[PDB]
Design a protein around this ligand. Structure first.
Ligand code: SF4
Ligand code: SF4
Ligand code: SF4
Ligand code: SF4
Ligand code: FES
Ligand SMILES: [K+]
Ligand SMILES: [Zn+2]
Lengths: 95, 126, 114, 48, 208, 96, 360, 113, 176, 230
């Protein structure tokens, strides 16, 4: 989900964009500013929440030794889902 | 007699090769470093340290890194006692200041004070 | 308070050694200018030699000035033989270095350095 | 591929004559190989 | 303690202790300390005036025969008033042994050169003079050996910064390589990695 | 290995050795570039009982050096070690 | 035509390695030892690892020791190939340079397969080795060592019996034994004069006392005897390589003291203690007990020593590197007295001089 | 046996090792007779030199003399005798049996700081 | 335990003397060297046809750096700064802040490819396999500034070389 | 004088009556590990990390709360003291979350430091860990109670120094939690000191969150000018 500027400059996923009166836009003159078109914040928002029937859940990121360290997520709160601190996947209790 | 008498103060600033504006314009600080409040260990507060004042750091125009022009920015020296640090600073021609070591005064600890009969030091819970 | 001497027992022989080193440098300056094809005159080289000796002229310890004479002798031997290039000889003259301001007002204008 | 040749010549690539709009008839490049074939060509694997 | 702990040698420890007693008793005029480490290494700390006699004895005695000089080093410890510790490592091919002889000096006191005993000491203490500024009296040819020809200051001292005071660049106006005050695009980041907890209680220093 | 028999014969005559027995160019005799996955063994400390770290702490058994002499009879002279043994000539190829 | 004085000016590659080592931890200081002698990488890594393990009071597992000795012998083959071929190239023969550089490329392939880097592997670490050998490596090592005998034979055919080659080496740089001992020489320079000394035989390390090999001993101290000693050391390295292939034991590769060696990546992502140890070992590093040690090994250029001084923290207080090229270049003045200019370049060649280890 | 070559470059073969070794050991004894008796260097070197002299005098053959002297060839034994004589003269000149010249400072050999 | 290289005495009978003198006069060993170099002429050369043929490599090869992602689009780096702590050349600069949804993510991740010694400590100090050293090695640039990678360049390298980096990691992760 | 004599590792030391084992060991330069003891808080004695062995006594005592009587010999580096330390460290790390890369206490964690120094090197736990629901106590202190070790410095500080008495312990057994039991904001003028005294990353500074790591920060000792206390 890239965004443009009134200058015409692309805005990175960290929110950086050179100012209109900034002199450092001259480095892109005759060249291009490289940005990543895949925004991870927008990409992790499309993952559906996983519904489980336990009070706690365990996440390793998938793949076992190829993922993140295994963490345990509590699902006692009903107002919010339980997000994994590493991979960003969220879980919800079935009840 | 193979042993001559020199009654002058020890000064070696003409041999170290340091430029003069890094000698006459620098303030050395001699101090015992404070214990980090995030930890209860006291092994880092045993030795005296001498360091220098922080000069200007600016931003790189290309990448935004931290650029400096001070060669003494990372110079930290370790001494066992205060007088060794004082003599090392005075030998090298650095104007220095000294901060006294701060030690924790002893406390009076009693587990039975948590359940006093008539004193305010009772604990509301445990 | 008794210390082991290096070469000089007291200040007189140390001053003699300083005198001899200055004489040797003063003699070699024209040959250094000619052999290295320097852009300076002989007078500028001799003024630089005198300036270094005058800069280093506030010392009263015989061992310190003995070490200073020793290091000057090493530099002179390093220059007599062609071991230094033209850049090492010309590094005494800071031609490309910008003039550092000295008064308070200009230092206040240019930055935070005292 | 040609497995009778010795190790080093037993796999090779003939580059295309036009990649991403650039004429590569004489201007071939080592960075012209996509990664899925880059793993096979450098003998990091046996399977194309 | 079998698989993951280094096995201890005790016969070598006993032999090295006996030879340390032997040396410290033959030469009481210069020997100040004799110690044997955990991993069976013998260190003899001597007075600086007896560098030539101790080394000549260790080279020439029938019970020593330390014919090889492996390494000669100085160590900079700024808290001591004699901040430079000069270390000789000797190897004896006859008895298949190694010894360490240590002495001390400060910035202004010269040390007697050991070229007249071991010939590797020429380049070794030329390097020591270049890096620590320790003068060696009665040297054949003492100059710099590793630093630049116009270099000022001794870099292996601990008050000398990591990056120096000058840097080189090519200037087109003078058509020459010139030295300028050092400026870094990125400052060297200092890391405070020391743990605030004591690791080895056996090396604990007594309080004041 | 693609050379003809005549070139092989001339090569072996001029070299003086059978070059075809030991070819410096590798062929299909080497191991494959794709291998089955391994299963590495574990060390001796991978145990559930009698595995206290204080019984196998190598670094904590290190001691400060023992001071033999400090400045604060008819005993025999002592060498640093027994004298080294004379080397024996090689039985395999003494070059003699 | 006769040389009266030789003054070798060095310092053109003085990087200042020791101060940078003093500013970093031990794991960070290992690649500095990788880049010291850039033809003898694993030997320098092994010397550093041996010194740190001596100070840490730990010992590596046996499989790591056998791997260390096998790769030390492969490193010896690389170093001797480079030394002899560059010596011949400087004298004027250029064919064996290419002929043995093909096998050098093969050994570089072995290094890359085991570590991922062709030259600076950073493989031998304090506590063992970083990664286990992949499957099928030792078969390729066996085939290469099977053909290396014929490779040495062909180099010896080109070089040894030639009258032009031996005319440049028969009476050049003769060193007496006592002068070799006094000048601090080690390794092939000591062995060419007849001194029977070898650190793998007299003061052995990991499993070098379990392998059988001979030691070439010269008789005249010239360059020809030193060249013959290097060729025979190639042959003995092949012998030790075969013995190490036939006696490889099973087991782990790092020491199981997880406060020194980092744990596996599978147990790091599951166990709390392993995760804490991984964090602290890759940020702060292991603490070495206070003390000073001198550890010397038989590198292919001679006695390679590390003098390591640790103050108890996770970074070394002092790290002196004793290199044999320093002493050999110091003795070059005595070597090249009463000789010609071409004899001077042959004398420089017959000392295995890499200026990365000389200037440091 | 008349060994052709000692094996070490620059070390000439001795034709008469017994007379050379006896002369060198007696010379070492006469030089060491000037050192004071309470000096440990004199006692230790007299002991080892007397042992070596008795061993040399008790063996007419050279190969078994080399084997029981434990010093390699007989020529390096002669070299070590010469080096010991030179050291004995130098130690007469230096006089290192005197008490210690100077005490070190308080924390001269304290590690770590 | 030792052997005597070059201690062979020459025989002094007439056979050996005439053999040595004939070798001197007729140049036998020179013909030997000539003939063996001739034999080495008639062998197939070991030259490969670059760039059409590439030298062999391994799944452990350390080339260009890349930043990986989880198999859902989310990036793997969680700004723990272990790679910049373990870097022996101090080639990594990391700056972090909590982003919009509260996740712990980097805002700056620079690697100086002219400072880096390509040692692979960062890819083995990473707890989540975020930073990797990919198999690419042909990335020579015409400018110094093109070798100063920011976060966007490393993420683009990861998206470019994922199909090979994941396979190499799958092949090698059981040895770690 | 009223001082009595005790021995630490065989070394004699004169201590005042009422001195604990921990302070006596501190008098000779030995710092016994702690997780709950604070010198400016009351003694709780529940973490059991300070279990030291007194010789000629078949039971380890809690050094933070045990007073010394005369003639006692304290063995700070004996075998069973180290065994007790290893067992208590194993029990503390049994249910701790694997959150070290994502936690701000990393590099300055007391649990990490004296697990590396005094604990074992591997885990025998083959079960599943617990998970604790996070709480909200204000915009200043970020709360992640899965990392809490129930050291109860929270309640002792908030009751004896801040004088708020809002924090407490609710539950029993392994389900015991530290919190306020209601949606209450612990808003005082001394709230950040509970971030300071937490030995683990359970309470962290929300403005400082995810910004730096402790090893790379340069420290400058200065004086606060926000008020006239100095
Ligand atoms: S490969 Fe090594 S030098 Fe390069 S960025 Fe990674 S840790 Fe730093
Ligand atoms: S080690 Fe991995 S997770 Fe940690 S900061 Fe570096 S790339 Fe990110
Ligand atoms: S509180 Fe300490 S042990 Fe727990 S996750 Fe944070 S750094 Fe790791
Ligand atoms: S949150 Fe921290 S200070 Fe509070 S009880 Fe838990 S561990 Fe102790
Ligand atoms: S410190 Fe004593 S029980 Fe916690
Ligand atoms: K905290
Ligand atoms: Zn997850």
């Amino acid at each position: 989900g890239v965004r443009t500027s009134p200058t015409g400059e692309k805005v990175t996923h960290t929110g950086q964009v050179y100012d209109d009166e900034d002199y450092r836009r001259v480095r892109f003159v005759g060249r291009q500013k490289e940005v990543n078109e895949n925004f991870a914040i927008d990409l992790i928002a499309e993952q559906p929440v996983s519904q489980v029937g336990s009070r706690v859940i365990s996440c390793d990121g998938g793949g076992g030794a190829l993922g993140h360290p295994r963490v345990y997520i509590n699902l006692d709160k009903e107002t919010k889902t339980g997000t994994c601190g590493y991979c960003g996947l969220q879980f919800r209790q079935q009840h | 007699t193979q042993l001559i008498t020199v009654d002058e103060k020890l000064d070696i600033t003409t041999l170290t090769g340091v430029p003069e504006e890094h000698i006459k314009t620098r303030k050395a600080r001699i101090f015992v470093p404070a214990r980090n409040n995030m930890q209860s260990g006291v092994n880092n507060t045993k030795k005296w340290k001498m360091e220098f004042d922080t000069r200007e750091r600016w931003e790189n125009p290309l990448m935004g890194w931290a650029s400096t022009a001070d060669p003494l920015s990372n110079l930290v020296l370790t001494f066992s006692t205060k007088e060794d640090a004082i003599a090392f600073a005075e030998k090298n021609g650095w104007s220095y200041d000294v901060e006294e070591r701060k030690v924790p005064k002893p406390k009076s600890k009693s587990y039975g004070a948590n359940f006093s009969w008539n004193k305010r030091t009772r604990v509301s819970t445990k | 308070t008794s210390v082991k001497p290096i070469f000089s027992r007291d200040m007189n022989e140390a001053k003699r050694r300083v005198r001899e080193l200055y004489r040797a440098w003063y003699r070699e300056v024209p040959n250094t200018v000619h052999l290295f094809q320097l852009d300076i005159s002989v007078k500028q080289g001799r003024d630089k030699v005198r300036e270094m000796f005058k800069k280093n002229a506030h010392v009263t310890d015989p061992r310190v000035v003995d070490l200073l004479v020793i290091k000057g002798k090493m530099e002179l031997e390093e220059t007599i033989n062609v071991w230094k290039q033209r850049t090492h000889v010309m590094r005494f003259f800071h031609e490309t270095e910008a003039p550092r301001p000295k008064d308070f007002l200009s230092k206040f204008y240019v930055g935070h350095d005292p | 591929e040609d497995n009778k040749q010795f190790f080093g010549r037993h796999r090779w690539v003939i580059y295309t004559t036009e990649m991403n709009g650039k004429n590569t008839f004489w201007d071939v490049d080592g960075s012209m190989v996509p990664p899925e074939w880059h793993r096979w060509l450098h003998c990091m694997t046996d399977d194309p | 303690t079998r698989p993951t702990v280094r096995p201890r040698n005790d016969v070598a420890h006993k032999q090295l202790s006996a030879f340390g007693e032997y040396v410290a008793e033959i030469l009481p005029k210069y020997v100040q300390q004799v110690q044997v480490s955990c991993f069976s290494e013998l260190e003899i700390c001597i007075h600086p005036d007896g560098v030539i006699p101790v080394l000549t004895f260790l080279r020439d005695h029938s019970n020593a025969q330390f014919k090889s000089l492996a390494d000669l080093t100085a160590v900079d410890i700024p808290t001591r008033q004699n901040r430079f510790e000069i270390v000789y490592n000797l190897l004896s091919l006859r008895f298949n042994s190694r010894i360490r002889v240590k002495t001390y000096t400060d910035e202004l006191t010269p040390v007697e050169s050991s070229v007249s005993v071991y010939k590797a000491a020429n380049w070794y203490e030329r390097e020591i003079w270049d890096m620590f500024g320790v003068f060696f009296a009665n040297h054949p040819d003492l100059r710099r050996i590793l630093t630049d020809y116009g270099f000022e200051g001794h870099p292996f001292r601990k008050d000398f910064p990591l990056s120096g005071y000058v840097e080189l660049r090519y200037d087109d106006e003078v058509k020459r390589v010139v030295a300028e005050p050092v400026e870094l695009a990125q400052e060297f980041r200092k890391f405070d990695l020391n743990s605030p907890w004591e690791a080895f209680p056996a090396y604990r220093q007594p309080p004041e | 290995a693609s050379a003809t028999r005549l070139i092989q014969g001339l090569r072996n005559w001029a070299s003086g050795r059978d070059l075809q027995a030991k070819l410096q160019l590798r062929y299909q005799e080497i191991s494959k570039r794709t291998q089955p996955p391994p299963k590495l063994p574990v060390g001796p400390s991978h145990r559930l009982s009698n595995n206290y770290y204080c019984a196998r702490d190598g670094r904590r058994e290190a001691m400060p050096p023992s001071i033999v002499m400090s400045s604060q009879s008819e005993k025999k002279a002592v060498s640093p070690a027994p004298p080294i043994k004379r080397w024996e000539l090689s039985q395999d190829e003494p070059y003699l | 035509e006769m040389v009266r004085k030789c003054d070798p000016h060095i310092g053109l590659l003085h990087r200042g390695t020791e101060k940078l080592i003093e500013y970093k931890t031990y794991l960070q200081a290992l690649p500095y030892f990788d880049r010291l002698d850039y033809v003898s990488m694993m030997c320098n890594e092994q010397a550093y690892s041996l010194a740190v393990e001596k100070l840490l009071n730990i010992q590596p597992p046996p499989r790591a020791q056998w791997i260390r000795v096998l790769f030390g012998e492969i490193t010896r083959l690389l170093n001797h190939i480079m030394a002899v071929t560059t010596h011949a190239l400087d004298i004027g023969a250029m064919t064996p340079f290419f002929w043995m550089f093909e096998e050098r490329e093969k050994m570089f392939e072995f290094y890359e397969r085991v570590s991922g880097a062709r030259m600076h592997a950073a493989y031998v670490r304090p506590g063992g080795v970083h990664q286990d050998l992949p499957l099928g490596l030792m078969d390729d090592i066996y085939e290469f060592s099977k053909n290396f005998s014929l490779r040495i034979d062909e180099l010896e055919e080109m070089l040894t019996n030639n009258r032009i080659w031996r005319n440049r080496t028969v009476d050049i740089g003769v060193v007496t034994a006592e002068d070799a001992l006094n000048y601090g020489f080690s390794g092939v320079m000591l062995r060419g004069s007849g001194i029977q000394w070898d650190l793998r035989k007299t003061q052995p390390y990991d499993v070098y006392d379990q392998v059988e090999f001979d030691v070439p001993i010269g008789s005249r101290g010239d360059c020809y005897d030193r060249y013959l000693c290097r060729v025979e050391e190639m042959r003995q390295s092949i012998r030790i390589i075969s013995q190490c292939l036939n006696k490889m034991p099973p087991g782990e590769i790092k020491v199981d003291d997880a406060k020194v060696s980092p744990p596996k990546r599978a147990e790091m992502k599951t166990s709390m203690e392993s995760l804490i140890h991984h964090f602290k070992l890759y940020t702060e590093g292991y603490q070495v007990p206070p003390g000073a040690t001198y550890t010397a090994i038989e590198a292919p250029k001679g006695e390679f020593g590390v003098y390591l001084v640790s103050d108890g923290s996770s970074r070394p207080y002092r790290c002196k590197i004793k290199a044999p090229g320093f002493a050999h270049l110091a003795g070059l003045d005595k070597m090249s007295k009463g000789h010609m200019l071409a004899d001077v370049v042959a004398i420089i060649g017959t000392q295995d001089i890499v200026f990365g280890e000389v200037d440091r | 046996l008349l060994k052709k070559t000692t094996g070490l470059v620059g070390l000439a073969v001795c034709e008469t090792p017994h007379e050379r070794l006896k002369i060198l050991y007696t010379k070492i004894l006469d030089v060491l007779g000037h050192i004071p008796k309470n000096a440990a260097y004199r006692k230790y070197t007299e002991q080892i030199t007397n042992e070596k002299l008795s061993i040399v005098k008790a063996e007419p053959d050279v190969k078994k003399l080399e084997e029981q002297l434990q010093g390699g060839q007989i020529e390096e034994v002669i070299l070590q005798a010469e080096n010991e004589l030179s050291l004995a003269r130098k130690m007469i000149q230096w006089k290192p049996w005197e008490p210690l010249v100077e005490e070190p400072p308080a924390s001269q050999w304290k590690w770590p700081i | 335990t030792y052997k005597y290289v070059n201690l062979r005495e020459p025989s002094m009978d007439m056979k050996s003397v005439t053999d040595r003198a004939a070798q001197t006069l007729l140049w036998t060993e020179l013909i030997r060297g000539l003939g063996m170099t001739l034999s080495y002429l008639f062998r197939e050369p070991a030259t490969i046809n670059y760039p059409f043929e590439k030298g062999p490599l391994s799944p452990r090869f350390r080339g260009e750096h890349a930043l990986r992602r989880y198999p859902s689009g989310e990036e793997r780096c969680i700004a723990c700064k272990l790679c910049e702590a373990v870097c022996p050349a101090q080639a990594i600069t990391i700056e972090a802040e909590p982003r919009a949804d509260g996740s712990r993510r980097t805002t700056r991740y620079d690697i100086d490819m002219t400072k880096c010694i390509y040692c692979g400590f960062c890819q083995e100090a990473c707890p989540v396999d975020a930073i990797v050293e990919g198999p690419n090695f042909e990335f020579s640039t015409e400018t110094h500034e093109e070798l100063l990678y920011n976060k966007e360049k490393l993420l683009n390298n990861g998206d470019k070389w994922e199909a090979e980096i994941a396979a190499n990691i799958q092949a090698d992760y059981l040895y770690r | 004088s009223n001082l009595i004599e005790v021995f630490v590792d065989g070394q004699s030391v004169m201590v005042e009556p009422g001195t604990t084992v921990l302070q006596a060991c501190e008098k000779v330069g030995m710092q016994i590990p702690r997780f709950c003891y604070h010198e400016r808080l009351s003694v709780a004695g529940n973490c059991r990390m300070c279990l030291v062995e007194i010789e000629k006594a078949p039971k380890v005592v809690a050094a933070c709360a045990m007073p010394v009587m005369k003639g006692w010999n304290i063995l700070t580096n004996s075998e069973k003291t180290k065994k007790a330390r290893e067992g208590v460290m194993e029990f503390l790390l049994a249910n701790h979350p694997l959150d070290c890369p994502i936690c701000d206490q990393g590099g300055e964690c007391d649990l990490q430091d004296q697990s590396m120094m005094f604990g074992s090197d591997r885990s025998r736990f083959l079960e599943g860990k617990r998970a604790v629901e996070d709480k909200n106590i204000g915009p200043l202190v970020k709360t992640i109670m899965t990392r809490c070790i129930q050291c109860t410095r929270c309640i002792r500080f908030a009751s004896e120094i801040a004088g708020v008495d809002d924090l407490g312990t609710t539950g029993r057994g392994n389900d015991m939690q530290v919190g306020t039991y209601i949606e209450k904001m612990f808003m005082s003028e001394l709230s950040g000191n509970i971030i300071d005294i937490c030995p683990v990353g359970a309470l962290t500074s929300k403005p400082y969150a995810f910004t730096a790591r402790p090893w790379e920060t340069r420290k400058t000792e200065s004086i606060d000018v926000m008020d006239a206390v100095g």
